[PDB]
Design a binder for these strands. Structure first.
Length: 240
RNA sequence: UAGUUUAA
């Protein structure tokens, strides 16, 4: 398990961060790890989800629903996480090498790059969503095959996430997970829709209590929960 | 930041 904080610096003044920055941040991270390691940057774009990143955390904010989030604080930080040590490596160097970010009209400098300590998984534990968890099912509109975004109150929901994890864990850990049973009781929730390119993505910010696997947890902890983790979704933090 | 606008 490896988790890092990347502190960012705003320029110029009265900085305003759009809410769907979500996609771009990932795009730029893919350029940056590309130049220095085109080979490891293939895992970044992998849909099977070898990593996660969080929202850009803004500690002092004024929320102005028209324009975006107001930055009142010196620096804002973003947290990348993953199970295999070598992606974090790539990104550390990659961004420290070309620390120029722009999301919409807000340009960014990479201030320091630290390493976050990983709070030891409990026996039974609780997670807050550090970036909205996504889960989807196939849905047909007439002829073509598109997908439909799920929320915890949809019933299929709990059942996709079981598949989505077991699928993902076998597809990276390389083997089937020993114990496949888990259940998550949902303590909080807010839905969100974020933009990517021309399309939309709906996912569930939420707090919740997970029980029933060492690895499914240790795994969802490192690489996040559900689908599309690579784009900045699924990352969780463990509060108790 | 138990939180972040907009609800196919």
């Amino acid at each position: 398990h490896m988790r890092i904080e990347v502190k960012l610096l705003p320029l110029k003044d009265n900085p305003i961060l759009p809410f769907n920055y979500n996609y771009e941040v990932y795009s730029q991270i893919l350029e940056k790890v590309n130049s220095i390691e085109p080979t490891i940057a293939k895992l970044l774009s992998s849909p099977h989800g070898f990593w996660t990143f969080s929202r850009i955390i803004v500690r002092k904010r004024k929320i102005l629903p028209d324009k975006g989030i107001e930055i009142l604080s010196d620096d804002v930080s973003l947290y990348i996480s993953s199970s295999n040590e070598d992606i974090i490596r790539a990104i550390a160097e990659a961004v420290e090498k070309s620390p120029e970010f722009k999301i919409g009209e807000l340009s960014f400098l990479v201030g320091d790059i630290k390493a976050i300590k990983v709070k030891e998984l409990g026996k039974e534990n609780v997670f807050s969503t550090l970036s909205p968890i996504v889960v989807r099912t196939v849905k047909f509109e007439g002829n073509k095959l598109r997908h439909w975004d799920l929320y915890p109150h949809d019933e299929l929901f709990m059942d996709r996430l079981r598949k989505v994890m077991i699928l993902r864990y076998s597809e990276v850990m390389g083997e089937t997970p020993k114990d496949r049973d888990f259940t998550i009781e949902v303590l909080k929730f807010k839905p969100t829709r974020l933009m990517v390119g021309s399309s939309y993505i709906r996912g569930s910010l939420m707090v919740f209590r997970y029980a029933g696997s060492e690895e499914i947890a240790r795994f969802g902890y490192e690489n996040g929960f559900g689908e599309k983790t690579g784009l900045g979704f699924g990352m969780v933090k463990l509060i108790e």
